Structure formats: structure tokens, C-alpha cells
Design a protein around this ligand. Sequence first.
Ligand code: ZN
Lengths: 21, 30
Amino acid sequence: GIVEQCCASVCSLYQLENYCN
Amino acid sequence: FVNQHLCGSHLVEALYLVCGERGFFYTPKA
Ligand SMILES: [Zn+2]
């Protein structure tokens, strides 16, 4: 999941937008 | 914008910044 990807790997602010309500 | 290495509370901070008033769900893996 994103929590995992952002930490083990890297992620973008655009990928994070997918978790907004 | 740039790519991000975000663990623990730093990820929560980033979600708060990105989503703001919309709110967000923080949903780690079990
Ligand atoms: Zn820290």
C-alpha cells in the first residue's frame, strides 16, 4: 500500500492525492 | 513537485498537506 511504498520506496505528492476524501 | 521518501509520522504530515480540508484516510498494511 501507499504507507509501505512511500517508506520502502518513494512516492509522489500526486500519488498521495489518491488518499484524500 | 518532487518524489518523496516518507516514513511514519512524516507520511501523515504529507497527507495532511496534500489533502487539507478534504481530509484523508491513513490505511497501513496489517
Ligand atoms: Zn523523523
